[PDB]
Design a protein around this ligand. Sequence first.
Ligand SMILES: NC(=O)c1ccc[n+]([C@@H]2O[C@H](COP(=O)([O-])OP(=O)(O)OC[C@H]3O[C@@H](n4cnc5c(N)ncnc54)[C@H](O)[C@@H]3O)[C@@H](O)[C@H]2O)c1
Ligand SMILES: NC(=O)c1ccc[n+]([C@@H]2O[C@H](COP(=O)([O-])OP(=O)(O)OC[C@H]3O[C@@H](n4cnc5c(N)ncnc54)[C@H](O)[C@@H]3O)[C@@H](O)[C@H]2O)c1
Ligand SMILES: NC(=O)c1ccc[n+]([C@@H]2O[C@H](COP(=O)([O-])OP(=O)(O)OC[C@H]3O[C@@H](n4cnc5c(N)ncnc54)[C@H](O)[C@@H]3O)[C@@H](O)[C@H]2O)c1
Ligand SMILES: NC(=O)c1ccc[n+]([C@@H]2O[C@H](COP(=O)([O-])OP(=O)(O)OC[C@H]3O[C@@H](n4cnc5c(N)ncnc54)[C@H](O)[C@@H]3O)[C@@H](O)[C@H]2O)c1
Ligand SMILES: Nc1ncnc2[nH]cnc12
Ligand SMILES: Nc1ncnc2[nH]cnc12
Ligand SMILES: Nc1ncnc2[nH]cnc12
Ligand SMILES: [Rb+]
Lengths: 461, 460, 460, 460
Amino acid sequence: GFTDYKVADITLAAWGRRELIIAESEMPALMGLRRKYAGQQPLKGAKILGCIHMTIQTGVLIETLVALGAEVRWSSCNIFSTQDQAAAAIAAAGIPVFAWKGETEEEYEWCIEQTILKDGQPWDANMVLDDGGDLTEILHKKYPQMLERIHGITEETTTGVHRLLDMLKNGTLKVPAINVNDSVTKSKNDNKYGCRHSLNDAIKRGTDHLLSGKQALVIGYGDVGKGSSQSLRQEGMIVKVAEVDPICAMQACMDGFEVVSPYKNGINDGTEASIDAALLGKIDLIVTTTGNVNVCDANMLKALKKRAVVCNIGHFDNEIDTAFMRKNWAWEEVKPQVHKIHRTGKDGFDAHNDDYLILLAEGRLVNLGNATGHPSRIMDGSFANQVLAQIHLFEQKYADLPAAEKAKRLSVEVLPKKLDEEVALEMVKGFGGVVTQLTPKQAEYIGVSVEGPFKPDTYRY
Amino acid sequence: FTDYKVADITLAAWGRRELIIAESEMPALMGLRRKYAGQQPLKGAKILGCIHMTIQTGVLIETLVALGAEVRWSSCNIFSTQDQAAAAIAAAGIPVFAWKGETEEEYEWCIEQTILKDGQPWDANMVLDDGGDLTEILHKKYPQMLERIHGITEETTTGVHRLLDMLKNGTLKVPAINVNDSVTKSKNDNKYGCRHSLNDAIKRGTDHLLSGKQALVIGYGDVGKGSSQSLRQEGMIVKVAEVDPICAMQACMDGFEVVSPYKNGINDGTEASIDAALLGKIDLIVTTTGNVNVCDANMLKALKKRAVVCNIGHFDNEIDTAFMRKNWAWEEVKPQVHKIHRTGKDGFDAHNDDYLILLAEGRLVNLGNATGHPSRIMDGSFANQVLAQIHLFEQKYADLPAAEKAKRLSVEVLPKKLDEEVALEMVKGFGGVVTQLTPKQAEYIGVSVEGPFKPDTYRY
Amino acid sequence: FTDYKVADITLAAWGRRELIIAESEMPALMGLRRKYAGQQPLKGAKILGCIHMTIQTGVLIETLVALGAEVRWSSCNIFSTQDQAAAAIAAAGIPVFAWKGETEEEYEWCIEQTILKDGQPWDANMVLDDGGDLTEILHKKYPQMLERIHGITEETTTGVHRLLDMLKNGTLKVPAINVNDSVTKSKNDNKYGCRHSLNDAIKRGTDHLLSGKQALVIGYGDVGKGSSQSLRQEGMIVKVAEVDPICAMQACMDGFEVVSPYKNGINDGTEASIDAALLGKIDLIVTTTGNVNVCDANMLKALKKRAVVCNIGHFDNEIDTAFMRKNWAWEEVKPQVHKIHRTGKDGFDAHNDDYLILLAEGRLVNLGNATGHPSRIMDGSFANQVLAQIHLFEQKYADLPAAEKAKRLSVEVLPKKLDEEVALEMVKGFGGVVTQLTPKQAEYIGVSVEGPFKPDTYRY
Amino acid sequence: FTDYKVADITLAAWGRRELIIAESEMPALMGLRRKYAGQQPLKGAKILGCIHMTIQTGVLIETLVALGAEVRWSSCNIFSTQDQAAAAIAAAGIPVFAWKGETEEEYEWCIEQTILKDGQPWDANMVLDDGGDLTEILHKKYPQMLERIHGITEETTTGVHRLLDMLKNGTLKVPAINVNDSVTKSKNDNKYGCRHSLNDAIKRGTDHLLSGKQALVIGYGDVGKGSSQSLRQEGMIVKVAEVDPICAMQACMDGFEVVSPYKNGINDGTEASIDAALLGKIDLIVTTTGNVNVCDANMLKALKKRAVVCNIGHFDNEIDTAFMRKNWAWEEVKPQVHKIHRTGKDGFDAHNDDYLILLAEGRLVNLGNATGHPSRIMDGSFANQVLAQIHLFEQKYADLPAAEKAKRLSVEVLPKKLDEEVALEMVKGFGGVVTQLTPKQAEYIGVSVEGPFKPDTYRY
Ligand SMILES: NC(=O)c1ccc[n+]([C@@H]2O[C@H](COP(=O)([O-])OP(=O)(O)OC[C@H]3O[C@@H](n4cnc5c(N)ncnc54)[C@H](O)[C@@H]3O)[C@@H](O)[C@H]2O)c1
Ligand SMILES: NC(=O)c1ccc[n+]([C@@H]2O[C@H](COP(=O)([O-])OP(=O)(O)OC[C@H]3O[C@@H](n4cnc5c(N)ncnc54)[C@H](O)[C@@H]3O)[C@@H](O)[C@H]2O)c1
Ligand SMILES: NC(=O)c1ccc[n+]([C@@H]2O[C@H](COP(=O)([O-])OP(=O)(O)OC[C@H]3O[C@@H](n4cnc5c(N)ncnc54)[C@H](O)[C@@H]3O)[C@@H](O)[C@H]2O)c1
Ligand SMILES: NC(=O)c1ccc[n+]([C@@H]2O[C@H](COP(=O)([O-])OP(=O)(O)OC[C@H]3O[C@@H](n4cnc5c(N)ncnc54)[C@H](O)[C@@H]3O)[C@@H](O)[C@H]2O)c1
Ligand SMILES: Nc1ncnc2[nH]cnc12
Ligand SMILES: Nc1ncnc2[nH]cnc12
Ligand SMILES: Nc1ncnc2[nH]cnc12
Ligand SMILES: [Rb+]
């Protein structure tokens, strides 16, 4: 009798369930939590609004939250990232989900609204799980009465955390949050190694281009840029890296990359004359990794080598000036999420034109748009942290605290290191790794407990 | 001029040649000489320095002097000095007491010669240390001297741990800067420096092929990460041991198998707990931990015949070399390379097959068997050292009123802005070009166009 | 009448879009289209082709046609066709009989539709093959057709072996060119193509993380070298098995541990000879040999639960899939991905932990679960194919008198000069610039300025 | 015993210590010493040897002697001898004439001391050469000695070229084995040896950081492949130049940019032909070609200030050092390391910034600035040398009548079966386990279970 969902094709559910069963075997930290906490039901009474890519990996997260006692209502945080078989399996399990691959922007917003509302009125939500901040923003702008009864937000990704910290600085954040991104077992796992796995994967699925021997430019060298650069260099690309942060640039040099700017002497003067046209005319592939705006701009797009591939793996598509391309150039769909963009003019194109770019996923995050995002065994870490964060904020019960106590608890915090380590141990055991136990003398010598935590909070790994 | 002791002053011209090359490899340090020449911010500084007396240290010393300081110098390891560097510094009229191959007694004597001038304590007012030995001597044996010292700038992970322990116990007498935890130090020197210099030292000592052979790296912190890469890039099959599951996770994702020398990771000190099958396949063991007895006697007994054993952590006690001296016969191959014959203590057969090769008697192998990190990496570390010396010297802690000293007695890192400035100089040295944010982009991500670019929480 | 059979003709426009992209990635092959357009060297050629019906093959087919040939085409594997490529070729008026997911009976029928036109033998005079199946069928079932065929151009290592066996036995009826052993084929396609496409296929089938996990690659020839790199570059811990000690030496030096599935390398046919400890740690096994039963039933029994099993050699009999069909229960995950439940033959528990994942039913995994090698690699192989077709067609073997045909049966390779010319075009496609020898330099090393640059003995 | 000339006989005990270690790293060569000691297959052989007098060569020499040979030895390069090795060999009663840092006159004198004993031709009957200098002297100056010599075993690519030129011209007087082209030589020593030893030598000479810097490798044959990897694995950004498009294709697919020093690759002798922008960004140039003047005067003028220049090909004429001696001022940094000041010929400013660093005066840098290839790599080369000596000595060419000599006067390689046997011992040295084919698998691929496993056409 269950009908409170909207997905592309419910008949994909059996396939999705087969893939979920495989994924559980790849997610020991998350499944460890499900086993440890199922008896105690720490999320009994939790009512979680979730907005994160509706993949098979997210499916295992959802069913872990449910197994621990939560009810949820779910949507994706990107128009192209849903795996339709995952969405179907979740709907078939009696869980409200509003998600499909290839949403319009209007549909995207509608799906988030369907999580917020049940039977035309605000749902009795008391927790939020977000990736990128779009749900968080809608709640603050449109549903402040619902935020009165929400105990916390657990935010997945670097861009979302930045948005939360801006709200906090402005005094507009209404409920506390956990920055899940900055667990080591998230940032230095998912953001880096996930993109190492999934960037080359997506480019191959979209284009089937040989990468070896060809020239790439990676814009950014944070966690995503590091992983992305390795994804390409391990395939034999000649990778150049751009950065605004000299410390990240130093890392790129030491890691064996040439550090370059798209602009002469690194200065964008707003004009085509500031573009290093010689550089860009040699680039076969450009990848944006920044979380910033317009880092592959119109003038860069004009200067790129004919037939270059352009993609973004940061959270939002505005890293690349796709609006310029929609206004000025002709788009030819190769296949879904792969477009040739003909630089010859706006209205039509010659089928045999040589002067085009290939854009993946319309500039949306390419790993999820053209492939399946990060693998289960990587997302295990991120999602174990999500579950721990949900437990922590739900147990703290912020919404029920008196005003004076709320004032002390209204913050954006990370999980304690001890929990980050516990996640990591389960990941290591999944690989068959064996951690050494400190002797009492060794523990004393370095000033730690034998069980951890092992590093000071200052440590950067 | 006679206020020095080095192996051979005639090596000075060679040392100077290598200093002139090193200056061209150290743009951040040379940039500081140009920037601060006029101000002379270290005029009146009298710096006790204790750090490996290499060519790179020579460029650091001469930068401090160019900025107005006087110094008195020693090495922080018995095997790390480059005798041509020490000679060039002595020839420049700078007091230095250092040679490659000191005894422990000579090591202590050399530190004492920095502390004393013309037979009595120098009027020192600053300290630059690597590992904490000088810091410890001043606190334990010369506490009066610390009354006049404005600060300590500490280079390395082990030294910082020692400082933080003193602060927690209330025994630290002057403020310190943790130079190690600049990003342009920890995530440059500790990691990439060991990547360059570990394989270098093993080749110079043994000339062993590394490709195709089995290594075990104990630890996967900064040093262990770099060391593991040093070996894997040469084609070794590297396994990694760790106590910290987060570091272990990184090792897995970086493509290493994570193993323990002990069955199920449980080290009860018995021979039975050793994974003998594992250790019997290992051709090379490298310790990287900063901890004690992480390559223990039972592990040494179980290693494959003819395995190489070395340490790249600060102190030799990572490896139970004392057990080896007490029980097994040492055959010097050449300086800093010993075959250790497991057949007994008193004599050996020249053709015995059952030996280990120990490098540098367990002392830090990069400096012992090679020349440590390259100039262009040490540029970052040492630019931070000079900035830290300037900051603490200008603060003049010793002369502050009591209430202000209480607020300033701390162990701090340099500001991120300065870490970034050092990094920019390093990048420019490679010919790298950093992009400048537009005003709209800087607003979008919430930073100034000039930086800093990341919040203090950022881990890189 | 539609003289083709494809899955879905409406995919033609998509195929054509991808052909146009592929032409831009295949400069050697497109260069041949332009160079030989005027001459029409294949005018009058009627080519039976049997090779994976991919986008890359489509560019090859259209090159042959552009040079004057007519063709009739089928795939050489039941899972390797890209339906959009087949559709684009059919839509262009070229007879093609190919779809992804053929049965064995359909596979044979498709080859027969190339051989027969309108119910009788086509007047074929050339053969292009990959693996020998079309060659075998012609010799077995249509020997009279071979009286009119000038030659065979064979793509792959296994096909060449089959030809050489026929030649030794006196059963080969027409001469052949071994296209596999051009350097721009064997040391390009076989190696780098598998480097690109093996990890690709595993990701598409399973989306498994590879980093940190254990692989066993059986073989270290060209395919095995490329396959091992495909996995090691992703961060797998790769072990390699080999029978050839020279290839095993290369694996060691390349940084791999060389191991056998069998104790001391000796297979006794029983479970007692299996190294169960080794196989119980393997997450992924890949066969690369061109041999038979190199991942046998006893190995399959001993593999770690939930290991992935795949083959990238030409034929599925590298793995004992017959044993698995007879004894274990198969659960389709999605097309070309099966969980094989080791609990028994008749049914399975949906939540069983004791299964293996088999890709492409053991058929070549790169083509079965992905799209095979990329266009820019296939450019080299297919340029060689075109050149080989030109050469044998021009030689006109079928028109020789009977006594001379007997004398002219051989299996030859293309000259090194042509291998170099193909390589130059490939290099230019990367933007690479080859240096020209001066006359003095050419004299010094004993070559012509134009090449060839190496003696025929050279191994690259 | 006095029939020797070395730098310092007192280094002998050190050399012997290192020989004992090297024996443990050379299982193929030691396996041959054990296998053939009883039979004494080189009893009566009198071998003139000319090859780098290293510890590795010492193990080779002592193997030949252990199998019954007498020898008289010299080095094939002025900088390649390890003086402790030479001393250990002389102390063993073996005639050796070699030291590190010979003049060219001393080099020639040392070869002559091998040829002559007590002022008259020795009764030589075999030749072991690396590079052909000894071979050339015998043919030009001592043709009567060649009448009684059974063969030459030639180590390296350049020497083989010289032999093949003699054969083509009809001037080769005795047969030869091309030891270079064993797989366990060419695709071991030439490639992996340079991978190990190139970065080693650059670090020992300069201690420069390599990571992040730009290199240009001239050539991409076996030595250039290994050299490129030596630098790329350290994090250099490596560009490759080639004249052979097949090798260039390999470089592209291996992840390198292929560039020419010259515009459009045309080396017309003009300054304007140099790609000034390219050469002005290069920090390190390495020549690997075996050709002449591949790092020419105009390239040297255009290089980035403070670039390192070195050669790893056999002869120094790869680089135009003569132009540098004629035009620029040389400042010795330390032995085998010179700064070459581009400011003029007569003097230099000690602080000039416009210099290059040349290693080993352009002579092969691995041996000149380090210790050449490691023992476990040289094991393969030298096992092949021993086998080749046995083969030619047993064939007894000198004793054949003129008509029979004509049939055997050739340059040949060892049989593949022997190449495989060498490789097996190398793999066992790593602990590798090769799988044994079942009889059915051997039949399926058409080989004997024991090998050989590949046809003679196979390129590995
Ligand atoms: N696709 C995925 O699956 C995935 C995974 C994790 C995070 N993300 C997203 O990827 C983005 C990056 O995340 P991160 O964790 O790497 O952030 P980060 O802050 O670690 O790195 C971003 C980097 O971009 C650099 N940068 C900013 N503006 C630049 C410019 N104009 N030119 C060059 N470099 C510039 C910064 O200096 C910084 O080092 C965010 O939007 C994050 O939410 C996506
Ligand atoms: N040789 C050099 O030039 C050089 C360079 C920099 C630092 N250092 C020294 O190297 C040492 C390591 O420094 P670091 O910055 O990498 O420190 P770190 O704290 O980053 O790393 C040390 C690692 O050792 C691990 N560890 C501790 N006990 C262990 C055990 N019993 N088994 C396995 N792993 C264990 C820890 O979990 C930790 O991750 C320190 O002594 C430091 O001063 C040496
Ligand atoms: N999937 C693809 O796209 C693709 C590409 C090229 C070739 N191929 C096919 O791949 C196969 C291998 O081709 P290749 O060119 O690498 O051949 P190869 O002869 O170079 O290599 C095969 C290797 O297998 C080894 N081997 C044989 N039996 C073995 C055993 N029992 N255990 C371990 N090692 C064993 C051999 O010693 C040899 O080195 C052939 O079937 C070929 O036709 C496939
Ligand atoms: N230092 C060592 O220990 C060592 C080891 C083995 C061989 N060698 C020597 O190294 C040299 C190279 O040997 P190899 O086995 O690699 O030979 P090779 O024939 O395999 O490779 C030499 C390469 O140089 C290229 N080349 C020639 N002229 C060129 C030019 N003007 N510009 C660019 N590329 C050019 C050729 O095309 C060829 O591919 C020989 O002198 C050999 O005797 C030295
Ligand atoms: N070269 C060097 N000089 C000084 N301290 C160092 N620490 C590591 N390498 C060093
Ligand atoms: N893409 C491809 N097309 C045709 N044959 C192939 N063999 C391997 N990959 C191939
Ligand atoms: N170590 C070595 N000994 C002799 N010949 C060599 N050629 C290269 N390295 C060598
Ligand atoms: Rb150094």
